[PDB]
Amino acid sequence: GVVLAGAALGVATAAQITAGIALHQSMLNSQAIDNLRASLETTNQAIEAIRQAGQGMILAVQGVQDYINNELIPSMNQLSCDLIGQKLGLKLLRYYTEILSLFGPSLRDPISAEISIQALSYALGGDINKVLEKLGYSGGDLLGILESRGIKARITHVDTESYFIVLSIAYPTLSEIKGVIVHRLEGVSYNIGSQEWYTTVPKYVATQGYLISNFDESSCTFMPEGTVCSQNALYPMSPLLQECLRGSTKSCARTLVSGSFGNRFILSQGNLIANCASILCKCYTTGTIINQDPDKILTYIAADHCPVVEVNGVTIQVGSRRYPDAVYLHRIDLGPPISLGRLDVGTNLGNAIAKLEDAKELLESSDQILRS
Amino acid sequence: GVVLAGAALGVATAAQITAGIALHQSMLNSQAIDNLRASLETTNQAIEAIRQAGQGMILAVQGVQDYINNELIPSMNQLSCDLIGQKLGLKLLRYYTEILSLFGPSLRDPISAEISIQALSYALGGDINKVLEKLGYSGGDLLGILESRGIKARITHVDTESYFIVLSIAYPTLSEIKGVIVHRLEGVSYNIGSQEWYTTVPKYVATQGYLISNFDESSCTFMPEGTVCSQNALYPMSPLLQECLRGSTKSCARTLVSGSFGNRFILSQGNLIANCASILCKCYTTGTIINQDPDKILTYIAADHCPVVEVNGVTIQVGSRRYPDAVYLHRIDLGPPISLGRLDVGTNLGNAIAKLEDAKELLESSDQILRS
Amino acid sequence: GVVLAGAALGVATAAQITAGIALHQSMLNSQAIDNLRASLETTNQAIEAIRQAGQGMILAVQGVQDYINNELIPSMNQLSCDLIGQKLGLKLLRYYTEILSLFGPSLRDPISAEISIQALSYALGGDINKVLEKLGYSGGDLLGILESRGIKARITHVDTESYFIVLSIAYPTLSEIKGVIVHRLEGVSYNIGSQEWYTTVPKYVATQGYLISNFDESSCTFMPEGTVCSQNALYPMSPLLQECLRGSTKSCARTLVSGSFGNRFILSQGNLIANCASILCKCYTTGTIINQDPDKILTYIAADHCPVVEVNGVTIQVGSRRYPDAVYLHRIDLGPPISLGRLDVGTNLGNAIAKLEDAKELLESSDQILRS
Amino acid sequence: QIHWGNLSKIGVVGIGSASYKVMTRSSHQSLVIKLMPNITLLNNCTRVEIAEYRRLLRTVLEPIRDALNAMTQNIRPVQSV
Amino acid sequence: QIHWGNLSKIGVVGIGSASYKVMTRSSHQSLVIKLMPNITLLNNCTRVEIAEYRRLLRTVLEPIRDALNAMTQNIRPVQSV
Amino acid sequence: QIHWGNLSKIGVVGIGSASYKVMTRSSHQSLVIKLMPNITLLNNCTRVEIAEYRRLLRTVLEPIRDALNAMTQNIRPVQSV
Ligand SMILES: *[C@@H]1O[C@H](CO)[C@@H](O[C@@H]2O[C@H](CO)[C@@H](O[C@@H]3O[C@H](CO[C@H]4O[C@H](CO)[C@@H](O)[C@H](O)[C@@H]4O)[C@@H](O)[C@H](O[C@H]4O[C@H](CO)[C@@H](O)[C@H](O)[C@@H]4O)[C@@H]3O)[C@H](O)[C@H]2NC(C)=O)[C@H](O)[C@H]1NC(C)=O
Ligand SMILES: *[C@@H]1O[C@H](CO)[C@@H](O[C@@H]2O[C@H](CO)[C@@H](O[C@@H]3O[C@H](CO[C@H]4O[C@H](CO)[C@@H](O)[C@H](O)[C@@H]4O)[C@@H](O)[C@H](O[C@H]4O[C@H](CO)[C@@H](O)[C@H](O)[C@@H]4O)[C@@H]3O)[C@H](O)[C@H]2NC(C)=O)[C@H](O)[C@H]1NC(C)=O
Ligand SMILES: *[C@@H]1O[C@H](CO)[C@@H](O[C@@H]2O[C@H](CO)[C@@H](O[C@@H]3O[C@H](CO)[C@@H](O)[C@H](O)[C@@H]3O)[C@H](O)[C@H]2NC(C)=O)[C@H](O)[C@H]1NC(C)=O
Ligand SMILES: *[C@@H]1O[C@H](CO)[C@@H](O[C@@H]2O[C@H](CO)[C@@H](O)[C@H](O)[C@H]2NC(C)=O)[C@H](O)[C@H]1NC(C)=O
Ligand SMILES: *[C@@H]1O[C@H](CO)[C@@H](O[C@@H]2O[C@H](CO)[C@@H](O)[C@H](O)[C@H]2NC(C)=O)[C@H](O)[C@H]1NC(C)=O
Ligand SMILES: *[C@@H]1O[C@H](CO)[C@@H](O[C@@H]2O[C@H](CO)[C@@H](O)[C@H](O)[C@H]2NC(C)=O)[C@H](O)[C@H]1NC(C)=O
Ligand SMILES: *[C@@H]1O[C@H](CO)[C@@H](O)[C@H](O)[C@H]1NC(C)=O
Ligand SMILES: *[C@@H]1O[C@H](CO)[C@@H](O)[C@H](O)[C@H]1NC(C)=O
């Protein structure tokens, strides 16, 4: 075990402290560095496994060796010595730009920085498939792990004398969180009179028993056997938005849409939910047009009323009723209209704040006035 | 004519339904696939047109055939057999990586996925100019169409036995929407005493008769003959921001600027509109400095008072007056001050919301207080 | 000295006017353009300096010349005439695509546009290192300047007869802004009962005596000797968030965190600030567990109570006390809970505005209510 | 419509206007990506590399084929209606 | 300034400070992109490819030149006024 | 949980659900980036290009090595405490 000299270090984040201590476990001892240095100055291949008997295997990658071995060396006997240097010099400078881009001052906090294997592609010679193979990284979860950027490297040693960087790379293991379901949501517009509206809900939500939370899909990959995320995708949802998803329609916000909205119908449980006041709904079998009542906002089409329906020039056959008939608008409590844009939010928030400021005197006199 | 079995399909988005039906008309028949498979297994070029009379012309693209025909085959008599395999093996792995990037698990819904021709550039051999030519895509609008990402491809057939993908490519036609004008807006700062302010308005707005809406420029290209958009760019503007643009200045939000702001003068309609309290305005003709009174927020410079004005060390000649002389601050209704950053928004929104709960009992006893 | 004719120009931004005038002193005069065209014709190198006596040096870059001299010319005796043309044609088309990408219709307002040297890399032959060497751009500040993208180019002259583009390029110098300190902030979660909360503060803030402002790190590069920014990084901070940073804790907003939060302890001034109610804190020197009182939200561990502490599986040594030991929750006034997501903001803002609309008649009855 | 008079009094002006054009698709062409190169003139110097190449492609192509099949099985003639 | 004492009671600390430097420019150099390669030693094996290359370039260069000409013609010597 | 009945009355439906998997890492391998190529068979034809390449590399490598040593000097055996 080791102890961090926190009094001497002074200030450090949890990420820096953790990665600093993990550096003790992941760094080679000085004897390995001396043997590794001698091993490195014996190889001439782009990828080579160096096996120090009694210690774990080390993979060595040279980023311009293929070009030298495949292009420059065979050309030695028929090109001038000066052109060979110009051709290698072109590649070395291009390689340096990648090393500068990856390990330069843009790389903030080298100790706690994690670099994906794909970002290492150019430094490894342009492709990573051979490296993953020689690392033994394979299986049925490779695509889900790789596309979600799940293979991270970490710098453990930098050798200025012999010009090499040691990285620590790990192949992750996938584990399912029990009781967590990621739901994908989709919406359909509806009409109130001549105005077309759309309910504002998250694209993805997650549930765990009673609890509902937001879901961040940026680091996730949706595989057929489940979503695979390389970070924490779960993050809290505001209490008012949770009331929306729990059945309070007045808590859900709504927004106006453009004149060319393309989400005016959906197929759900073999039934068609369509804004027939905004698209042309016709019953194919009987040939009559399905009209949407002005006191209704949506149409729920099932086979009990129309076995086969045409919606936008597309003919659709629908199954048994899984959604009841549309109810009147007076039985649905609708939420507040909003605009989601950055400048629209600022203009409206500024108006609301100014209104609160102007009435500050009366709001800060409520207890007395209600007790008169 | 085809029908969709919604009960069998169960659940589907409108985009999925539309794209899926389009497969019926856009697919090659079972016989055409068999003849295509034979035609592909006799070509040896990177781009080739397949002339199957009675059916539309097919363009075949091989992503590594240029390298084989230009580099490997000519060098056959000078390189060893093992080196030939190593050189090709490098290109195949990089090509596979690009194919995995395009069509792998990151490609969420292959059926309704639309892929721009630029994104297919590496899959097509690195460059798309020869493909656009062989497809017959040319004309005076190609640059506007191409730079808007307007040439999209759909996946129609994937053959695992003979390893090819069939795509449906289309060249759009441009049409002008009648009575729609896209306006570009620019602003300059103004001083209220010692504080420099800026009005918050969208960069682009669109008008149709008396209607004002937001304009999304992300998919658009501003050509000399009009703005070319590959998507619908118009989206609704909040009513409060519409009041601003209709001449209600009190509905317009304003924000402070940094001490090194760049928009402090503008040339408009031959006149110079400048914040002469935050920059140096000097009349070149007489050498007298143009000073802005503290009861005025902007200066409107025309030739009737200064034929030649120098601002920020730039000498400018102006025309006849087409803006009024600046009016006093007390004749301008100014809007609320706002901070647009997401954390500034959240800090101010959370404070404003918190003030609403403290008055919740007061706001419910509204009709009781107002009636009595 | 020149004058701009604003009456003939009509409309222009300050950036357009400034860049339009600066074009006067940066254009090679009509005599040099004639001399330049003759000089360009006689060169056969990818990079070469044009030494015309009495006038500043001009660097000429040919983007495909390296490939011609290195790859095609040496192979003229072994390849056919047709294959030579096919290989160069492939490079020409790829080069044209990059020119179209840089200088095509996506380039809005070419006169006022600034292109960083890194963006021009492909147009210059794929690498900028040799161009910077022959431009004389070197020194101890290159790394910070280059990574901030501070070496900018502007289009000066375009000749469609001999097909060349003249650019004006400048190497900036760095100037400290006296009295400006950029502070980095980091946070640690605390617990109220069973819930884990987090204060919402900016990642970077900057001070100037009394004044505090937001800091935009997008164009900056935090070098060991200071922060180098290629744009104005300072922008105003809202008054309320200014109160937060000046010591008002109730002005600071706070958010619930995910169940797997990664910031639960921090090393600061040699002491550890740890949540200790969401992570296990144990004193190494005595083996006892550091339990957190439910009336306290944080733990401040110093050597006066635990010389060596093990937290989250890492053993850390701490120095003397430099933080007051934690106070009770009743002595801390906390701020409002908020949600930072765009959809959560819109949902809550829409709810807050609706309560304001529902309470209008009461708000403009304030003066009757307050006075009477 | 836009009141340019009041907008200039708080420093807002229009610096340009243009027409709005959108895109519509009329005809479609077929573009086939031939994934297997013609290697006949390369004798048999690429067997291992080609064989590895095909295996990697199958793990990508097969999921896409299944998605297409899962949609074209639900496409039925309107004559049945 | 920043009250670090109250910030620590809600879990906010400073983890580093630095000075602020900006950029200023005084001297400028001329960098010319030569778009036409020297192909003399290639005999005449690239005639068609070069000519097709020039045609593509003009469709990009001409609009840029026209914008520069528009601004320059509005620049006039200061002594004229 | 999610009240799908009321969500459908305002046009919101679920189109699919999936299980949630995260990542944990147990074993670690070492990957060394050999920055200096083997140029023995190039017969001293690239000396200047190699030396200039090394000079540029040092400007990137030294700051990172200094950062690693600064943290490593703060790691001490637990037996001493
Ligand atoms: C699925 O969707 C349905 C349909 O919307 C939901 O039913 C709604 O439920 C909400 C929330 O419970 C109801 O809203 C509340 O209704 C209460 C009953 O009001 C009745 O009595 C008043 C008398 O004045 C009548 O005017 C009115 O028409 C009703 O018949 C009220 O007590 C509530 O008002 C109170 O709101 C807040 C309290 O926090 C304060 O301002 C005041 O105290 C105020 O009194 C409120 O309006 C709503 O009525 C229901 N909609 C109907 C009946 O059409 C289901 O709940 C939902 N499913 C689930 C599982 O939640
Ligand atoms: C570092 O952090 C500390 C606390 O974290 C800050 O101390 C705060 O200082 C402010 C400003 O002085 C205090 O605000 C004022 O506190 C006074 C104390 O109120 C007493 O009486 C009430 C009523 O019983 C009790 O609730 C309270 O506990 C005290 O017994 C009051 O005089 C003020 O009341 C004001 O109320 C309203 C506000 O809306 C005004 O309209 C009134 O006119 C009146 O002024 C006010 O509340 C605050 O309480 C302190 N926080 C505490 C004690 O926790 C430091 O200022 C901060 N340092 C910096 C540099 O910011
Ligand atoms: C262009 O801008 C001018 C200047 O602001 C606008 O005039 C302003 O108009 C508003 C509303 O029309 C006036 O407010 C009104 O005041 C009266 C007096 O109490 C009251 O009847 C209304 O309830 C309302 O508050 C405002 O005073 C006036 N500005 C000034 C300085 O007097 C004008 O409307 C704008 N034009 C357009 C077409 O938007
Ligand atoms: C560069 O590569 C050459 C091979 O071309 C290396 O020479 C071999 O090194 C091994 C390693 O021990 C010896 O066993 C062989 O006898 C060597 N072969 C030949 C033909 O010399 C050489 O060591 C490398 N040089 C470096 C890394 O500086
Ligand atoms: C690979 O390309 C060769 C040409 O190099 C193809 O062979 C030609 O096939 C066409 C098609 O009928 C014949 O007209 C030619 O006579 C063939 N060439 C020669 C030299 O005989 C061949 O089909 C391709 N092989 C594949 C795709 O496996
Ligand atoms: C293209 O390059 C050729 C050489 O490849 C140039 O010809 C040389 O021009 C220089 C400049 O005056 C002379 O000093 C040399 O004597 C020329 N060499 C030969 C072999 O004639 C040529 O000027 C370049 N440009 C063109 C043809 O436009
Ligand atoms: C390549 O191998 C195949 C399979 O045996 C056969 O055509 C023949 O042996 C070789 N053909 C060549 C070298 O052209
Ligand atoms: C390269 O030069 C070295 C001297 O540093 C010499 O030992 C070696 O033999 C040379 N290589 C050759 C001649 O191939």
Side-chain angles (χ1 to χ4, degrees), chain B residues 350-362:
Chain B
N351 176 270
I353 287 168
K355 309 161 78 172
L356 289 173
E357 290 91 6
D358 186 74
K360 194 164 306 167
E361 182 66 26
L362 182 63

Side-chain angles (χ1 to χ4, degrees), chain C residues 3 81 150 167 169 247 300, chain E residues 1 6 8 25 29 31 45 76:
Chain C
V3 184
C81 200
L167 296 174
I169 191 160
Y300 301 90
Chain E
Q1 188 178 2
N6 277 327
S8 76
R25 296 171 181 86
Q29 282 77 58
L31 175 67
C45 292
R76 286 157 196 179

Side-chain angles (χ1 to χ4, degrees), chain B residues 104-216:
Chain B
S106 80
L107 187 70
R108 180 67 181 273
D109 184 10
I111 293 166
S112 63
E114 297 176 0
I115 299 100
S116 80
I117 192 66
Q118 292 83 14
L120 295 151
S121 180
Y122 192 107
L124 300 176
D127 190 60
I128 68 165
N129 295 304
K130 279 301 186 55
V131 160
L132 288 175
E133 175 202 306
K134 298 298 293 295
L135 274 184
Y137 296 173
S138 53
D141 281 345
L142 176 68
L143 286 202
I145 288 164
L146 189 74
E147 296 289 299
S148 287
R149 280 89 172 98
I151 307 167
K152 300 277 185 45
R154 295 284 184 87
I155 304 148
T156 56
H157 180 79
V158 170
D159 195 283
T160 55
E161 309 84 5
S162 307
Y163 295 100
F164 64 77
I165 304 155
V166 182
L167 303 162
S168 197
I169 192 67
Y171 185 50
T173 50
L174 285 180
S175 54
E176 206 168 293
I177 310 301
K178 211 195 58 170
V180 170
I181 310 153
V182 194
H183 296 282
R184 190 172 181 178
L185 296 194
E186 265 275 2
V188 296
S189 49
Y190 60 86
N191 292 117
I192 311 167
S194 64
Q195 280 192 120
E196 188 176 353
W197 292 89
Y198 200 60
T199 293
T200 54
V201 288
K203 178 181 187 192
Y204 287 105
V205 297
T207 53
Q208 200 159 9
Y210 284 165
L211 305 186
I212 316 171
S213 88
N214 283 119
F215 181 92
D216 179 3

Side-chain angles (χ1 to χ4, degrees), chain C residues 1-5 8-9 16 20-21 28 40 43-44 58-62 65 68 73 76 81 85 88 92-93 95-96 103 111 137 150 158 160 163-170 172-177 180-188 190 199 207 225 227-231 233 245-247 249 266 273 297-298 300 323 332 334, chain E:
Chain C
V2 295
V3 184
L4 189 150
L9 195 62
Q16 276 168 304
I21 286 305
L28 304 176
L40 284 183
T43 67
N44 64 346
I58 309 166
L59 198 73
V61 187
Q62 179 61 74
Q65 190 73 59
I68 292 160
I73 289 164
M76 282 286 311
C81 200
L88 186 48
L92 291 170
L93 284 168
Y95 190 78
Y96 161 71
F103 300 113
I111 281 153
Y137 294 7
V158 172
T160 59
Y163 293 99
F164 69 75
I165 309 179
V166 179
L167 296 174
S168 179
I169 191 160
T173 61
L174 296 180
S175 174
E176 294 205 3
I177 316 303
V180 177
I181 297 91
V182 181
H183 311 252
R184 194 175 184 176
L185 301 190
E186 195 95 7
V188 63
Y190 54 93
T199 295
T207 67
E225 67 275 16
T227 301
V228 178
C229 303
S230 63
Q231 303 287 321
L245 294 186
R246 279 194 182 72
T249 50
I266 194 150
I273 308 181
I297 67 162
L298 275 168
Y300 301 90
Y323 282 103
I332 314 184
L334 280 182
Chain E
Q1 188 178 2
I2 296 171
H3 198 294
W4 298 113
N6 277 327
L7 283 183
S8 76
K9 292 189 286 185
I10 57 167
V12 179
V13 301
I15 63 149
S17 66
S19 65
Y20 178 48
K21 293 208 266 280
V22 295
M23 286 171 188
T24 186
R25 296 171 181 86
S26 57
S27 44
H28 293 251
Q29 282 77 58
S30 285
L31 175 67
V32 56
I33 303 171
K34 176 182 169 184
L35 294 162
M36 276 309 126
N38 187 316
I39 60 171
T40 297
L41 294 183
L42 299 184
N43 300 356
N44 276 120
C45 292
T46 55
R47 278 190 171 125
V48 183
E49 288 88 0
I50 281 299
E52 199 272 332
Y53 173 59
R54 297 169 66 115
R55 193 265 298 168
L56 293 167
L57 290 180
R58 260 180 166 181
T59 63
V60 188
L61 300 183
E62 290 175 351
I64 290 187
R65 172 206 59 191
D66 298 351
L68 287 161
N69 286 355
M71 173 53 89
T72 298
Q73 82 205 357
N74 289 133
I75 317 294
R76 286 157 196 179
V78 68
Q79 292 77 358
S80 66
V81 299

Side-chain angles (χ1 to χ4, degrees), chain F residues 16-72:
Chain F
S17 73
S19 70
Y20 178 48
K21 301 205 267 274
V22 295
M23 285 170 189
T24 52
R25 295 172 180 86
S26 67
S27 57
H28 286 263
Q29 285 69 52
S30 294
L31 178 67
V32 57
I33 303 172
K34 184 181 160 188
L35 292 166
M36 287 290 314
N38 178 301
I39 59 171
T40 291
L41 296 175
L42 290 191
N43 301 351
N44 288 299
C45 279
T46 56
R47 292 183 291 112
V48 178
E49 293 85 1
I50 282 296
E52 159 74 5
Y53 172 58
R54 291 167 68 114
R55 195 270 299 183
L56 292 163
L57 288 178
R58 264 174 301 241
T59 63
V60 186
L61 298 186
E62 300 179 302
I64 293 184
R65 174 205 56 191
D66 297 353
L68 288 161
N69 287 353
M71 172 54 86
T72 299

Side-chain angles (χ1 to χ4, degrees), chain B residues 66-115:
Chain B
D66 283 314
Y67 183 68
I68 288 165
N69 294 347
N70 299 346
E71 315 298 339
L72 297 192
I73 292 179
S75 76
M76 214 64 198
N77 56 4
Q78 79 210 10
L79 294 191
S80 74
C81 182
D82 183 58
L83 184 58
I84 295 290
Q86 289 173 3
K87 294 182 76 166
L88 186 55
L90 283 174
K91 319 294 295 202
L92 292 169
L93 290 173
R94 293 155 189 171
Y95 191 76
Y96 162 69
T97 288
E98 263 308 305
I99 293 302
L100 164 70
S101 184
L102 293 174
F103 301 111
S106 80
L107 187 70
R108 180 67 181 273
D109 184 10
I111 293 166
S112 63
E114 297 176 0
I115 299 100

Side-chain angles (χ1 to χ4, degrees), chain A residues 190 192 197-201 239-255 297-298 300 327-338, chain C residues 347 350-351 354, chain F residues 1-13:
Chain A
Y190 58 86
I192 311 159
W197 292 92
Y198 196 62
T199 289
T200 59
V201 295
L240 184 79
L241 192 62
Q242 286 182 62
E243 281 266 355
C244 176
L245 295 190
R246 282 193 177 73
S248 179
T249 53
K250 62 166 53 71
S251 297
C252 313
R254 63 182 180 178
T255 188
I297 74 172
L298 274 166
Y300 303 88
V327 298
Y328 285 131
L329 189 42
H330 73 73
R331 286 198 64 241
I332 312 176
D333 294 356
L334 288 185
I338 66 153
Chain C
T347 307
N351 182 250
Chain F
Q1 188 178 2
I2 293 162
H3 194 300
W4 303 107
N6 278 328
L7 278 180
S8 67
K9 297 197 315 180
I10 60 188
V12 180
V13 293

